[PDB]
């Protein structure tokens, strides 16, 4: 939008909050995922995914202008991270998360 407005991504809940993220996800099926931001203090990011009637919210690291759900990875853009994992289990990046980007919470 104005720049890196990830909000354009169906899985981007943008201003949504964690508890809020869980609200939809909690109601959605396992695998349901999304991303959100609202801490107008730290330009950080985190992905939220539905797992076993529960939601997994993992924070994304930022340093080299790269995005990673784990201190061991790095992507150039959420969309390249999220949409790329659609075919790569999150457990490969996530710590406990054992699934893939099944569907966005916005769906």
């Amino acid at each position: 939008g104005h720049m890196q407005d990830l909000s354009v991504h169906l899985w981007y809940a943008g201003p949504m909050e964690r508890a809020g993220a869980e609200s939809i996800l909690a109601n959605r099926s396992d695998g349901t995922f999304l991303v959100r931001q609202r801490v107008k203090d730290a330009a950080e990011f985190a992905i939220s995914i539905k797992y076993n009637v529960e939601v997994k919210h993992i924070k994304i690291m930022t340093a080299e202008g790269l995005y990673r759900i784990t201190e061991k990875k790095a992507f150039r853009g959420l969309t390249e991270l999220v949409e790329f994992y659609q075919q790569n289990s999150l457990k490969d990046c996530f710590k406990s998360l054992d699934t893939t980007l099944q569907f966005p919470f916005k769906e």
Binding site: A19, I58, K95, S96
Partner: peptide, 13 residues
């Protein structure tokens, strides 16, 4: 509301 994503898990050195 005033909550967010704490940190499910992280990997140390």
């Amino acid at each position: 509301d005033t909550e967010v994503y704490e940190s499910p898990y992280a990997d140390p050195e």
